[PDB]
Ligand binder design. Structure first.
Ligand SMILES: Cc1cc2nc3c(=O)[nH]c(=O)nc-3n(C[C@H](O)[C@H](O)[C@H](O)COP(=O)(O)O)c2cc1C
Length: 353
């Protein structure tokens, strides 16, 4: 197949294999309530085979950025209904990315509380976007019973996404956030049932996945991974065995899809993870029209998610079909509530009259 061929993914027939990657934009602002501009933004992109939302924290403890939307409250759930209505009114399909940042945050975003983690080990470098610039804090290690609290927050988030009219949920198991912190032996030095073997390190991700499956059915659950461990101070002494284990466990659960942020190189685990998973595999990171087509024709991926191209190109599917020029993304308006429509809902389409 090629990028334009349909694909069945769980209980959905995608009309094409162009996916919108999850993209944090912070256009909700300090109430965390989704708004009509966010609804318009996803509706603009509804020609996608599948849309994935921006990461959505399942609890205030999972907030890493000012202006993120939430999925923990009824008022947030009501606000998301506008977004799913907008997408469904344009005949699109959308999953919510459900999220907990763990140690990748700052007490000023958590009402003075420490971010939480499997282990009291700070991420390297500075908190993104916050001024003045400051290092990540040493996080607070969860008790064993507080890990069950995290799973419950994921379950309730999966429930609220369902009440908000989503077609499914994708777990943010990627980019050094909480599930990835638990998964990798660089960040997880626990000695309870959540540390000290690949089985134990994968347990939180797989419990969160099982919570989502109980709400949605396996067909309406995806899991997002970053097997190169190249963002937010990640690292594991055997990435092939760690990610292989996750892929095989999710495959035994027959979930809708695995997605991965992982650019193509000789060291890519994607083809091995796709094989171990046995289901739909959505690749991502630095793909273009030709490399997307070549990867799908080679059976290396079933579909391709685009991040920065979908920021700048609401009609990306039509532009890729036409081999038309792409709008250049403006990184200065990727993030920030203040921006409103600017660099959000105002990128041009090919249409003129
Ligand atoms: C502004 C911006 C925000 C992002 N927010 C998220 C996020 O919320 N969840 C996530 O899993 N990845 C997030 N990513 C990563 C993208 O999903 C994607 O993996 C990355 O942009 C690489 O794909 P690309 O080369 O097509 O852009 C974000 C990337 C950008 C540029």
């Amino acid at each position: 197949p090629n990028l334009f061929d349909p694909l069945r993914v769980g209980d959905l027939n995608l009309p094409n294999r162009v996916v919108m990657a999850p993209l944090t934009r912070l256009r909700a602002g300090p109430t965390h309530i989704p708004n009509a501009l966010m609804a318009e933004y996803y509706g603009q992109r509804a020609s996608a085979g599948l849309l994935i939302t921006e990461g959505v924290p399942v609890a205030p403890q999972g907030v890493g950025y000012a202006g993120v939307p939430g999925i923990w409250s009824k008022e947030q759930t009501e606000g998301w209904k506008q977004v799913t209505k907008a997408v469904h009114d344009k005949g699109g399909r959308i999953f919510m990315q459900i999220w907990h940042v763990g140690r990748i945050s700052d007490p000023e975003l958590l009402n003075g509380e420490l971010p939480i983690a499997p282990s009291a080990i700070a991420a390297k470098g500075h908190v993104s976007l916050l001024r003045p610039q400051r290092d990540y804090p040493t996080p607070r290690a969860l008790s064993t019973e507080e890990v069950a609290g995290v799973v419950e927050a994921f379950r309730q988030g999966a429930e609220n996404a369902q009440a908000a009219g989503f077609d499914g949920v994708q777990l943010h198991g990627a980019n050094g956030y909480l599930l990835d912190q638990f998964l990798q032996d660089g960040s997880n030095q626990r000695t309870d049932q959540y540390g000290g073997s690949i089985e134990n390190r994968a347990r939180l991700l797989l419990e969160a996945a099982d919570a989502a499956i109980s709400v949605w059915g396996a067909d309406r659950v995806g899991v997002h991974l970053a097997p190169r461990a190249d963002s937010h101070s990640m690292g594991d002494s055997n990435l092939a065995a760690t990610f292989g284990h996750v892929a095989k466990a999710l495959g035994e659960r027959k979930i809708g899809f695995v997605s991965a942020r992982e650019y193509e190189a000789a060291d890519s685990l994607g083809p091995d993870l796709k094989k171990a998973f046995g289901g739909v595999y959505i690749a991502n990171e630095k793909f273009d029209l030709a490399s997307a087509n070549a990867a799908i024709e080679a059976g290396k991926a079933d579909a391709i998610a685009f991040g920065k191209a979908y920021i700048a190109n609401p009609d990306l599917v039509e532009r890729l079909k036409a081999g038309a020029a792409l709008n250049t993304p403006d990184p200065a308006t990727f993030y920030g509530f203040e921006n409103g429509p600017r660099g959000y809902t105002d990128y041009p389409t090919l249409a003129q009259v």
